Amino acid sequence: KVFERCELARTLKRLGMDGYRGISLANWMCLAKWESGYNTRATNYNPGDRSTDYGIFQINSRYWCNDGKTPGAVNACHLSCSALLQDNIADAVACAKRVVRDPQGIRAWVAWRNRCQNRDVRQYVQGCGV
Numbered sequence: 001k002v003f004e005r006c007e008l009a010r011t012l013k014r015l016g017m018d019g020y021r022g023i024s025l026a027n028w029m030c031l032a033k034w035e036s037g038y039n040t041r042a043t044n045y046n047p048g049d050r051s052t053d054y055g056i057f058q059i060n061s062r063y064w065c066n067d068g069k070t071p072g073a074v075n076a077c078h079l080s081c082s083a084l085l086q087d088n089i090a091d092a093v094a095c096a097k098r099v100v101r102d103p104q105g106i107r108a109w110v111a112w113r114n115r116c117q118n119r120d121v122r123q124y125v126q127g128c129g130v
Helices: 005-014 025-036 081-085 090-100 110-115
Strands: 043-046 051-054
Touching: 005 025, 025 110, 051 081, 081 090
Parallel strands: none
Antiparallel strands: 043 051
């Protein structure tokens, strides 16, 4: 599914992402926007290391979900990567929460650093009622 901006903002708020481990809602919005264009079915293969990024938050198979075909990978979220391609993002959110529980926090996604860090991210939630 391709979420609309405010629809996603309200969904994430309800799922408890606002301020999760110190990360504001607008930061999560910025991340989803640049990683997948708010698309839950997005997948991106990385030829370089044979891993794949899945779903709205582009979560990597080397550490977070199992896809069976990534060499030497782990599954910290304890999920099949298929779980990250559903229209319902509850599993993806629970996994994103797990990723930021590691020391890097939101910095774990390089797109966050490139496109969201130290920027005015208010834009992503303006007028959504969140």
